[PDB]
């Protein structure tokens, strides 16, 4: 048999942190835990007890001029991106810049060659799911007013048809819950719909 | 305001039923309230409470009053209600019971007032 096998840096790291070198390397986003906040750096801890630090250039955005302590405090965990890993010393440096924490989405290295990958199908499914995300729900509006009636434009005109000239009805507007359509009889078989824009609304159903 | 400053609160109860104690919470300012939660706030003015003196001989011995928070350590009554309670101020003690629901509050304010 071969002599006793001595663990190396990668094997020791995997044994201690129970995290593989592949799953913990450059270009990965992990929810680290803030442990100490300082003006020039922030000391954070990962899930696997790996102590990390970030130099002041990356805790806050380059455009912002605030203080690290005001924005982030102890116990406020944030997402971070791995920049460097000291496997021997179990030390890592992180970045809070959104160019890493947000843009890194397709982190897999799957070969997307059109000859062997159906890019068109994945794209089509992508707009399908994005349109599904765009899909929402809407409901009717209820208002309490003596001259308010939940009628269509033609319905309001027909309701005012049986009434003499000058009678007024109020119905929801098609421009949104912040708009109100008022229909009044200008003349026999002649009606005017006037849109009213609402400001400082307490509620969608409120006036 | 917390459980030591009036007006304040003692607990925050989530939808699932878990109770958040505000004495032992270090991040009380970091609590956001969602609709449907319950806040066990302090007793405030105009809260209906049932008020009682023993022995309860008749149904006028339990009546619902409106709370007014005052200093010092005694319950205070308008003197006209000392007749139905058969109470005077030579050392008598009386019991106060707090309703814990909207239904019970409505019952107290509409029936026993």
């Amino acid at each position: 048999r071969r002599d006793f096998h001595i663990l190396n840096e990668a094997e020791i790291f995997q044994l201690l942190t129970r995290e593989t070198v592949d799953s913990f390397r450059k270009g990965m986003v992990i929810p680290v835990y803030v442990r100490k906040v300082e003006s020039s750096y922030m000391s954070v801890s990962t899930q696997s007890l790996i102590a990390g630090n970030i130099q002041r250039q990356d805790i806050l955005e380059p455009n912002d001029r605030r203080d690290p302590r005001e924005v982030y405090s102890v116990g406020q965990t944030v997402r971070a991106c791995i920049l460097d890993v000291d496997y021997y010393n179990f030390k890592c440096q992180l970045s809070l810049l959104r160019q890493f924490t947000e843009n890194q989405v397709a982190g897999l290295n799957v070969n997307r060659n059109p000859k062997f990958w159906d890019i068109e199908s994945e794209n089509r499914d992508r707009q399908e799911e994005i349109d599904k995300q765009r899909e929402e729900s809407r409901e009717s509006r209820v208002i309490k007013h003596p001259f308010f009636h939940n009628m269509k434009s033609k319905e309001a005109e027909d309701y005012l048809a049986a009434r003499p000239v000058g009678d007024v009805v109020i119905r929801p507007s098609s421009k949104g819950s912040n708009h109100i359509t008022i229909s009044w009889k200008v003349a026999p078989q002649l009606y005017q719909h006037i849109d009213v824009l609402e400001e400082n609304k307490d509620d969608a159903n409120a006036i | 305001n917390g459980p030591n400053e009036h007006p304040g609160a003692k607990y925050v109860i989530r939808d699932n039923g878990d109770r958040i104690d505000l004495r032992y919470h270090k991040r009380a300012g970091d609590i956001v309230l969602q609709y449907g939660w319950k806040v066990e706030r302090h007793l405030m003015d105009d809260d209906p409470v049932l008020f009682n003196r023993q022995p309860s001989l008749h149904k006028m011995s339990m009546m619902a009053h409106r709370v007014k928070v005052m200093p010092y350590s005694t319950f205070r009554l308008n003197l006209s209600v000392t007749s139905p309670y058969n109470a005077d101020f030579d050392g008598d003690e009386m019991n106060l019971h707090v309703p814990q629901s909207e239904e019970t509050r409505a019952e107290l304010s509409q029936l026993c007032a």
Binding site: P31, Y33, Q47 | N16, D18
Partner: protein, 57 residues
């Protein structure tokens, strides 16, 4: 974590993964911290919802 089911004797299992709240931390898509027992809803897919039982990676 893969989504499959296994059957093993109690001896074969390594040990329970005792994790403190300083270790069992979850962050949602928007970056807001979510703790144990909270209710979250899937952003896409079946869009299901439920209470968190355990958080790992």
């Amino acid at each position: 974590s893969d989504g499959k089911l296994l059957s093993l004797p109690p001896v074969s299992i390594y040990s329970k993964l005792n994790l403190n709240p300083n270790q069992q931390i979850a962050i949602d898509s928007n970056g807001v911290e979510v703790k144990v027992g909270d209710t979250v809803r899937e952003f896409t897919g079946e869009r299901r919802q439920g209470t968190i039982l355990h958080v790992y990676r």
